[PDB]
Copies of this chain bind each other. A is one copy, B any other.
């Protein structure tokens, strides 16, 4: 019957047969035609090209070769430099471009034949800012890997102008995995709250060098802007008392999504993750999820456009596609729900700015969901007793309270004696008390320090 095929330009690799994005694309294309509910009388076909993702020339060449034959839409590369050429080609030839990864769009680029499935960092940075403000942070150390990281998290970077945050922007060393010098610089600077704008594998890298260095104590809270935090192997960090936090768009809390991800993991049995990499196994990266969702949303959109006589557009001469405008508007207005939750494209942009997030933080188990984030509503973090110990504190004033003169080691309340201890015993035998003496760590009386408006010792402990 009627048939249309989708163009696809992905990474050219040799160790693995083909990239994870291509895996997801092929999996979903052979899922659409197999699932008779979606595209019942039309079979989806995949046209796959492999490039270096950095040679925009060969990306343009492959896009032109695909457009020479019948292509309804191009699933462009997952880079920020070869995707611009492909979207320009698609716009000039009037064919939808399908971006599953974030790239910096020029403010004066009047291009409207592309859709960006990746959640816009214009909203993800606001989500990071809301997560920081919820934790009431004051010293925040934004860490990014690529120079485009500042462009990604620019709302977070501009936040100190509005809020009271103190930002110390740092960059991971380039062309090397030596994250130890940067963590050392944090240790000298006593930077405890960190925001990591690095990929999940790189995030696992810095987590490993942080554990090997001493960053995995209780006083370190890590916010990861990456959406693949659930793919990390937090087992070495599970019981370390670390407060690492992140987000997640891959809606794993669903039966259909669980079945899809389990099928994808079962299909992924040829390139297992490296055991000594700090990463999980049998999972699905967010890039594959966005590719799956992209091809699915294009399929559900083209469900409403039965006339799909793909043309033979050339690049030597420019000729807009007769079905390109309506198909592109249909893609932009298309509303589908899948692996990454609700998929709604911004009308004025084509990017996806209205997305549903789930907040992920480290707990006693591995990365439980502790809230949700929506661009409209905002951050939604949901996460006496008679037989209760009465914690008390005291200072070592010799006439008042002093350690009992017993050579035999003694613990609990009995190890403390003095006039104040006698008064506490009298109160306990007068009232109902089950009390334990907890010595003050600061070892001082309360003092209103005008330097920062902070108390200390017993008063602050109270």
Contacts and interface: CB of A to CB of B under 8 A. Distances in A.
A60 to B, nearest CB: 7
A107 B167 contact: no
A88 B56 contact: yes
Contacts of A111: 54
Contact of A170 (B81, B91, B107, B161): B161
A243 interface: no
A175 B88 contact: no
A125 to B, nearest CB: 11
Interface string A100-136: 0000101111110000000000000000000000000
A391 interface: no
Given A161-B185, A168-B160, A189-B161, A54 B154 contact: no
Given A161-B169, A161-B185, A92 B147 contact: no
Interface string A66-96: 0000000000000111001100110110000
Interface residues of A, number: 42
A77 to B, nearest CB: 12
Contacts of A185: 161
Given A56-B88, A88-B57, A109-B54, A158 B146 contact: no
Interface in A138-182: 141, 146-148, 150-151, 154, 157-158, 160-161, 167-171, 174-175
A107 B54 contact: no
Contact of A161 (B55, B80, B89, B168): B168
B158 A106 contact: no
A58 interface: yes
Contacts of A158: 169-171
Contacts of A92: 55, 57-58
B88 A88 contact: no
Interface in A245-293: none
B147 A157 contact: no
Interface string A315-349: 00000000000000000000000000000000000
Nearest to A153: B150
Contact of A81 (B57, B106, B146): B106
B57 A80 contact: no
A169 B160 contact: yes
Contact of A104 (B54, B85, B147): B147
B161 A107 contact: no
B151 A108 contact: no
Given A85-B84, A148-B151, A107 B175 contact: yes
B169 A57 contact: no
Contacts of A91: 55, 57
A84 B80 CA distance: 10
20 contacts: A54-B108, A54-B111, A55-B91, A57-B85, A57-B89, A57-B91, A57-B92, A79-B106, A81-B84, A81-B106, A84-B84, A106-B146, A106-B147, A107-B174, A150-B150, A150-B154, A160-B168, A161-B168, A161-B169, A161-B170
